[PDB]
Amino acid sequence: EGTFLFTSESVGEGHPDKICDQISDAVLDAHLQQDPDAKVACETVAKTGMILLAGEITSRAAVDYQKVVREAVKHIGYDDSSKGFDYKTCNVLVALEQQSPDIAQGVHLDRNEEDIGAGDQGLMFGYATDETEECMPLTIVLAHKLNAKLAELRRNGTLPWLRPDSKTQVTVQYMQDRGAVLPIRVHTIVISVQHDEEVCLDEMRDALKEKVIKAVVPAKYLDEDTIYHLQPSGRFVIGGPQGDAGLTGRKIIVDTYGGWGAHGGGAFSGKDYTKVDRSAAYAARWVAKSLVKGGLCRRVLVQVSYAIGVSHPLSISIFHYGTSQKSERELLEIVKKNFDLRPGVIVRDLDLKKPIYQRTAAYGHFGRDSFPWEVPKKLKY
Amino acid sequence: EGTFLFTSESVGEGHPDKICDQISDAVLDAHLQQDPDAKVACETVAKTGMILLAGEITSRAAVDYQKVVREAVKHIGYDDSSKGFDYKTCNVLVALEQQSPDIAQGVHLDRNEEDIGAGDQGLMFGYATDETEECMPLTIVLAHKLNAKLAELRRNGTLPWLRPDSKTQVTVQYMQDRGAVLPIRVHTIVISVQHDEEVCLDEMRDALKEKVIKAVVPAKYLDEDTIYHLQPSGRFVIGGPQGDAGLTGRKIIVDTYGGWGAHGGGAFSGKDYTKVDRSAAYAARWVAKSLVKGGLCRRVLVQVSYAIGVSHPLSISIFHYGTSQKSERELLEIVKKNFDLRPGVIVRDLDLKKPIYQRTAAYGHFGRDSFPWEVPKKLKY
Ligand SMILES: CSC[C@H]1O[C@@H](n2cnc3c(N)ncnc32)[C@H](O)[C@@H]1O
Ligand SMILES: CSC[C@H]1O[C@@H](n2cnc3c(N)ncnc32)[C@H](O)[C@@H]1O
Ligand SMILES: [K+]
Ligand SMILES: [K+]
Ligand SMILES: [Mg+2]
Ligand SMILES: [Mg+2]
Ligand SMILES: [Mg+2]
Ligand SMILES: [Mg+2]
């Protein structure tokens, strides 16, 4: 009957992969605070009792990695062995070297900033959809908000049995509308969250429905047929890195569009602007959102790609799902006349030397807080 | 004029992320050889001189991790300090614990195999396209074949300056055809490959065009306008983990569809069949390829999703790009009548206790070697 289901997930600040993303971006921010031109490629790994930093940094900054890592873990909420992880007493191991000189010479040494080469080859996508004001899929927006609500109720003490590691998943029934999509109802919600040894399962399931789901999801989307999977494993006392190893860049779909649109594969966290995996994906989001908010499309996917050492993108592509009166070729021409997607120009347009990256590393990089890539460009055409 | 560009990338066996995927799957295979029911979640991290294994394994097998890791690195070709990495002398560190008992009790303990719960929540996609016989995008097929050719010419000694770490990227111009896509020509090729200190840049660029590209890419796709970026960084002597940290699950788009279709975010390597990130993505590929090879569609995207501890998928969705006379609802009904996407049934249909996983961990998991998920199911409708 013209309807379909679509599912997206999100994870909380204490999910072990997301811990790693936040630490990687805390390290990036610490460098950028002192050296705006720091070259940073910081991967983090987390397992029981351990944060390991591994990668490549060339920077004039003097960074105390023990302090930066432990402060990030403190903020997430892992502050006691009873919770499975403690910033005060965990192991922090560092395996960081300089950036390869072969990369440096091929990318940025003795190059004018605007003409810096891409820091790697790769492909990146941006996406926007008019189904929400923030131009994001409803599935992923709701999933993120459910994790944020859990963290809020943990931190305000009203659900003191909550721990930081959580996952959520939202399935929405949609109608198709000339290539655009229209949310109808929420079909299924999953919530799994780490908890203390004392609270019982029925108390948790009742609280997750009444204090989390109902606080977040408009009642108009929930009905007698909605399916709830709340603490479906039955027990989640062991959690965080103790329950599951974490790595940076293992939540790339949570970080972006929740399965909608597409992904080029590259992780965001721990990387400075010369790594186009991040900067060009942010720019592609900016393009996509500019096209939708500018009234040219209702829904759009943008691809860009690069070669290491080369400034201009190798390819740019626009896919509008049939949601514009203009052809995709016409939209591509508008994009090319209004945007300069060299990394050394993106950095200026999106202010990408500013140390705001830890703020991006939970709850998605897009659709929130009026970051520069979320402020549409006025298009001339 | 109805044409568009699309870009995909691939990486070689010695790319540091791919090293980690191959080691993770070597560990999985080693366990499965002795214990077909091993529960494995093995992440690998690589940096200069180091392989670290971190994660969770519960298994009756007795596995010599030092031997398994070093044999995998040997096969890749890192056998001397002059190449940046040596299986004989690198550090192998192990941070492996049992699977969380809370996960085990919620997923598989005291469950009938067919009724085992999904090992996690999540979403997964399968994709197929009739543009090649193997039902894969031409962009990604060509990119993989370029890396395979590099490894072949390295191993046969005809380009003895080659080292194992490589990346390739292919941009194809396509025409749209009633929702299907038709490749026209290759617009741009990138190849970057690690090399010895003695070979010069012009020799490498000439060999990459004449002995690699021309050996792989049909001449009909290459013309006077094709752009070549061969060793675009100018120097790539430092490579492998020394040049760039590697982690398991950081090449998920290379592993799948090269930007085409969609991805749910979950990595494949190092995981047994109860981790639906892998098994349900393989099953979704199997569904998609069955629909295309069965003549029901020319191009199709399949989504499935799960909740931890629950056997049946929470959602199934079919998107045919307009390439079927049947509606998406009709195709979904055909899928539901022909496939059982419980993980404890997928394991039987796709033989997922068999230790063949290291073979999947380079050159893409799909479109090759007639693995069970590549053999179409005959559909009844
Ligand atoms: C199943 S392991 C993958 C993720 O699922 C979550 N998880 C861990 N243990 C459990 C559990 N017992 N029940 C439900 N989810 C869990 C954690 O966020 C982990 O990172
Ligand atoms: C740029 S670092 C990311 C990837 O690019 C490759 N790479 C590393 N060094 C170089 C180099 N000097 N030139 C081109 N590619 C490189 C390696 O495959 C690495 O994993
Ligand atoms: K893991
Ligand atoms: K890296
Ligand atoms: Mg993970
Ligand atoms: Mg990358
Ligand atoms: Mg990588
Ligand atoms: Mg996963």
DSSP string, A170-184: EEEEEEEETTEEEEE
Amino acid at B325: Q
Among candidates B374, B378, B2, B369, which has minimal Cα distance to B175? Answer: B2
A-to-B residue pairs, Cβ atoms closer than 8 angstroms: 255
PDB experimental method: X-ray
Q: Which residues are registered as beta bridge partners of B315?
A: B305
Distance, in Å, from the CA atom of B45 to the CA atom of B208, rounded to the nearest integer, reads 30
Q: Do residues A278 and A87 make contact, with C-beta atoms less than 8 angstroms apart?
A: no
Q: How many CB atoms lie within 10 A of CB A125?
A: 25
Q: Which residues are registered as beta bridge partners of A128?
A: A300
A239 lines ligand 1 (CB under 6 A): yes
| B54/A105 Cβ within 8 A | no
Q: B195: which 2 tokens?
A: 């090399």
Task: Identify residues after which chain A is interrupted (C–N over 2.5 A).
Answer: none
Q: Do residues B269 and A250 make contact, with C-beta atoms less than 8 angstroms apart?
A: no
Q: B89: which 2 tokens?
A: 């002398």
Among candidates B113, B93, B83, B91, which has minimal Cα distance to B14? Answer: B83
Q: Do residues B143 and B186 make contact, with C-beta atoms less than 8 angstroms apart?
A: no
Residues of A whose CB is below 8 A from B121: 9, 167, 169, 190, 192, 232
Q: Which residues are registered as beta bridge partners of B242?
A: none
Q: Do residues A168 and A90 make contact, with C-beta atoms less than 8 angstroms apart?
A: no
Query: Which phi and psi angles does B67 have, rounded to 5°?
Result: -65, -45
CA nearest to A321 within chain B: B321
Q: Could you tell me which CATH number the domain at A3-12+138-238 has?
A: 3.30.300.10
Query: Which phi and psi angles does A177 have, rounded to 5°?
Result: -150, 85
List the catalytic residues of A. 15, 17-18, 43, 56, 167, 236, 244-245, 250-251, 271, 275, 277
| B251/A305 Cβ within 8 A | no
Among candidates B130, B131, B162, B135, which has minimal Cα distance to B146? Answer: B162
Q: What is the stated resolution of the deposited model, in angstroms?
A: 1.1
State how far the alpha carbon of A255 is from the alpha carbons of A249, A281, B258, in Å: 9, 11, 18
Q: Is B291 left (phi over 0), alpha (psi -120 to 50) or beta?
A: alpha
Distance, in Å, from the CA atom of B44 to the CA atom of B59, rounded to the nearest integer, reads 18
Which of B100, B275, B306, B310 is the pocket-test mutation for ligand 1 (most atoms within 8 Å of CB)? B100
Q: Do residues B40 and B192 make contact, with C-beta atoms less than 8 angstroms apart?
A: no
Among candidates B322, B15, B302, which has minimal Cα distance to B146? Answer: B15
Residues of A whose CB is below 8 A from B238: 100-103
Q: B164: which 2 tokens?
A: 């194992």
- The conformation of residue B352, written as its DSSP 8-state character, comes to T
Distance, in Å, from the CA atom of B28 to the CA atom of B248, rounded to the nearest integer, reads 13
Distance, in Å, from the CA atom of B137 to the CA atom of B130, rounded to the nearest integer, reads 8
Q: Do residues A3 and A21 make contact, with C-beta atoms less than 8 angstroms apart?
A: no
Rg (CA), chain A: 21
Write out the binding residues of B for ATP. Answer: 15, 165-167, 233-236, 244, 250-251, 267, 271, 277
Quote the crossing angle between the two packed helices B276-293 and B328-338, to the nearest 10°: 120
Q: Which residues of A230-246 are buried (b: 16+ CB within 10 A; e: fewer)?
A: bbbbebbbbbbbbbbbb
Q: Angle A211-A214-A218 (CA atoms, 0-180°, nearest 5)?
A: 155
> What's the number of CA atoms in the CB half-sphere (13 Å) around residue B228?
16
Q: B35: which 2 tokens?
A: 């214990």
CA A199, distance to chain mean position in Å, is 31
Atom of ligand 2 nearest to the CA of B15: 18
Contacts of A335 (CB under 8 A, 6+ apart): A287, A291, A302, A316, A318
Which of A40, A58, A98, A103 is the pocket-test mutation for ligand 2 (most atoms within 8 Å of CB)? A103
Distance (angstroms) between ligand 6 centre and the Cα of A124 equals 10
Distance, in Å, from the CA atom of B143 to the CA atom of A264, rounded to the nearest integer, reads 14
State how far the alpha carbon of B231 is from the alpha carbons of A56, A109, A307, B156, B348, in Å: 21, 17, 10, 21, 45
Distance, in Å, from the CA atom of A315 to the CA atom of B171, rounded to the nearest integer, reads 7
Instruction: Tell me the H-state helices in A16-99.
Output: 16-34, 65-76
Tell me how close the Cα of A84 comes to any Cα of chain B, in angstroms.
Answer: 12
Which of B20, B147, B194 is the pocket-test mutation for ligand 2 (most atoms within 8 Å of CB)? B194
Tell the residue number behind the tokens 């609280």, with chain if given: A207
Distance, in Å, from the CA atom of B138 to the CA atom of B187, rounded to the nearest integer, reads 13
Distance, in Å, from the CA atom of B279 to the CA atom of B268, rounded to the nearest integer, reads 8
State how far the alpha carbon of B211 is from the alpha carbons of A91, A332, B141, B198, in Å: 49, 35, 18, 19
Distance, in Å, from the CA atom of A247 to the CA atom of A241, rounded to the nearest integer, reads 10
Tell me how close the Cα of B140 comes to any Cα of chain A, in angstroms.
Answer: 12
Contacts of B28 (CB under 8 A, 6+ apart): B38, B40, B42, B269, B270, B271, B272, B355, B357, B358
Q: From 3.40.50.280, 2.130.10.10, 3.30.300.10, 1.10.1270.20, which CATH number describes the B3-10+139-238 domain?
A: 3.30.300.10
Distance (angstroms) between ligand 3 centre and the Cα of A113 equals 38
| A101/B238 Cβ within 8 A | yes
Distance, in Å, from the CA atom of A153 to the CA atom of A211, rounded to the nearest integer, reads 9
Q: Which ligand is nearest to the CA of A150?
A: 1
Among candidates A167, A185, A142, A145, which has minimal Cα distance to A232? Answer: A167
Among candidates A90, A55, A88, A17, which has minimal Cα distance to A250? Answer: A17
Tell the residue number behind the tokens 């940096």, with chain if given: B47
| A116: helix, strand or coil | coil
Atom of ligand 2 nearest to the CA of B237: 12
Write out the binding residues of B for Mg(2+). Answer: 17
- The conformation of residue B213, written as its DSSP 8-state character, comes to I
State how far the alpha carbon of B137 is from the alpha carbons of A113, B116, B181, in Å: 36, 34, 9
Distance, in Å, from the CA atom of A250 to the CA atom of A95, rounded to the nearest integer, reads 20
From start to end of chain A, where are the E strands? 3-11, 39-47, 50-58, 79-80, 85-86, 91-97, 122-129, 162-177, 180-195, 227-230, 246-247, 299-306, 315-319
Among candidates B331, B106, B75, which has minimal Cα distance to A237? Answer: B106
Among candidates B179, B171, B381, which has minimal Cα distance to B291? Answer: B381
Q: Do residues A343 and A309 make contact, with C-beta atoms less than 8 angstroms apart?
A: no
State how far the alpha carbon of A159 is from the alpha carbons of A146, A149, A154, A309, in Å: 14, 11, 5, 51
